[PDB]
Amino acid sequence: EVQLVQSGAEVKMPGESLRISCKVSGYNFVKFWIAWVRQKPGKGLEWMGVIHPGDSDSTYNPSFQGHVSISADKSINTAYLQWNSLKASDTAMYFCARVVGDREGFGYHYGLDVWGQGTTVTVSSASTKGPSVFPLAPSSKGGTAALGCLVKDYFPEPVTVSWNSGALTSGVHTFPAVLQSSGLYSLSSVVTVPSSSLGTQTYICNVNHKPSNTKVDKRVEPKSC
Amino acid sequence: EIVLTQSPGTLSLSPGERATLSCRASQSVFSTFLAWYQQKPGQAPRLLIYAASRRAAGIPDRFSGSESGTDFTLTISRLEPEDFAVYYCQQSESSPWTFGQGTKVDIKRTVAAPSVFIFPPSDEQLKSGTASVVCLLNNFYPREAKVQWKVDNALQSGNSQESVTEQDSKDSTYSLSSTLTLSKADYEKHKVYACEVTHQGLSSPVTKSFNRGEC
Numbered sequence A: 001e002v003q004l005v006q007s008g009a010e011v012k013m014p015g016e017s018l019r020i021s022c023k024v025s026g027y028n029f030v031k032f033w034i035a036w037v038r039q040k041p042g043k044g045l046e047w048m049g050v051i052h053p054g055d056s057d058s059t060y061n062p063s064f065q066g067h068v069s070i071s072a073d074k075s076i077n078t079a080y081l082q083w084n085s086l087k088a089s090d091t092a093m094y095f096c097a098r099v100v101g102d103r104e105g106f107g108y109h110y111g112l113d114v115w116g117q118g119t120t121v122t123v124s125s126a127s128t129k130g131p132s133v134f135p136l137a138p139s140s141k142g143g144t145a146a147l148g149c150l151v152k153d154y155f156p157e158p159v160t161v162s163w164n165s166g167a168l169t170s171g172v173h174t175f176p177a178v179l180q181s182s183g184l185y186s187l188s189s190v191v192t193v194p195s196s197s198l199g200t201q202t203y204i205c206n207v208n209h210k211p212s213n214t215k216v217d218k219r220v221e222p223k224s225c
Numbered sequence B: 001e002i003v004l005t006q007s008p009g010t011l012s013l014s015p016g017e018r019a020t021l022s023c024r025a026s027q028s029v030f031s032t033f034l035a036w037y038q039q040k041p042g043q044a045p046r047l048l049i050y051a052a053s054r055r056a057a058g059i060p061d062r063f064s065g066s067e068s069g070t071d072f073t074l075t076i077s078r079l080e081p082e083d084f085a086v087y088y089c090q091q092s093e094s095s096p097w098t099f100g101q102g103t104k105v106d107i108k109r110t111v112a113a114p115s116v117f118i119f120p121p122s123d124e125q126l127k128s129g130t131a132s133v134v135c136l137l138n139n140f141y142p143r144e145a146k147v148q149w150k151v152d153n154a155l156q157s158g159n160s161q162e163s164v165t166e167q168d169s170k171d172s173t174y175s176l177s178s179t180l181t182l183s184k185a186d187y188e189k190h191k192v193y194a195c196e197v198t199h200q201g202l203s204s205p206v207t208k209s210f211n212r213g214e215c
Helices: B183-186
Strands: A005-008 A010-012 A018-023 A034-039 A045-051 A069-073 A078-083 A091-101 A109-113 A119-123 A132-136 A144-154 A158-162 A172-174 A187-192 A203-207 A214-219 B002-005 B011-012 B019-025 B036-038 B044-049 B064-069 B071-075 B087-092 B104-107 B116-118 B128-139 B145-152 B160-164 B174-182 B190-200 B205-212
Touching: A005 A091, A005 A109, A010 A018, A018 A119, A034 A078, A045 A069, A045 B087, A078 A091, A109 B036, A109 B044, A119 B002, A132 A214, A132 B019, A132 B128, A144 A203, A144 B116, A144 B128, A158 A187, A158 B036, A187 B128, A187 B174, B002 B087, B011 B019, B019 B036, B036 B064, B044 B064, B071 B087, B116 B190, B116 B205, B128 B145, B128 B183, B128 B190, B145 B160, B145 B174, B174 B183, B174 B190
Parallel strands: A010 A119, B011 B104
Antiparallel strands: A005 A018, A018 A078, A034 A045, A034 A091, A069 A078, A091 A109, A091 A119, A132 A144, A144 A187, A158 A203, A172 A187, A203 A214, B002 B019, B019 B071, B036 B044, B036 B087, B064 B071, B087 B104, B116 B128, B128 B174, B145 B190, B160 B174, B190 B205
16 A cells, blocks of 8 residues: 655744655655645645655745755655745645656656645744633523633644533534734634523533643633623 | 636535536646545545546546536536535646645535624733634524624724634534634723624624623
């Protein structure tokens, strides 16, 4: 089986160097080109460049050239994507992929037939930081009420949110986090419940931020006058 | 640079239905160099078709491709639940190799208007110098929804961010959060906070509001 195994998730500061790897198996590494593809969070695919392992002369997309380097070490079946100085704009998922083409020396390429699992790169001025958890308190309003928790200013991803220690699952929505201009993430977790349950049923959001070993249990109540 | 334009941006279909996706090249792309990929959330893309019409290894026969001039088509003859994903086209004829912007195939269902909710910033957060005002659009369909923030009837711009959930596994709806971020000083300078929601399922736009310091 042909496999492309990429290195683990990276969390870096602007100006730091970084080399991510793609180790291949199941075929002759020098008989196929390798491509690198960038995918920004919630965005489409962008071709970065290609390398023919061995005759290490890399071809770049002009918009990527100069800021990133593509190289390969045929002795260890590994392709690399490398930056000397990261920018917050380098935050994205990176994929390596095997290129397929003709068998007659035309130099034609058809596409990327086998892809690596991807490597997430997060570039931010922030250091590890646990979230502040604020209530999204239900209004004095078919008889459905909404309540939630605002999980603010944490780094890096991820946070998990459960409600009433996992007993409350129906109607729960935990939104994807947004990376704020400060370099810290923010997300909200909400639940719709019967309005008649407000003040009779306890609602607690259980937030866990494993990177900072932060566990917060926030009781969410209607705001008193 | 060869620009590939995919159409439509989103296809809303039911399992069992036919899906027809288009990819138009800015200049002539010879059929051998046009490929299609499928990408699922949290997964790498997968090669579906190469050379405009040839199925990649292990790809089922419900997937096919065809060309007509600068227009390339990917057809899914009968959608299976695993086919609701994002599809990209790519050309490898000219450097730089380029991708289309993608077409999302989502699950079709009846129109559902959002339930709208507004949340003021907590007293706890205000102690920090920042105020976050949250507007929730709950369980709606289709995806298209417009959220506009008003502070003392002044239309807001550039100070809000939206996040959307993936289509719900049980009811095929979307949910959306919009967060308005203000300094504590600006928050305390104004009284009326409102979010106005426009959606296909709402006969009139729905406005949810609160007055700062009222219950």
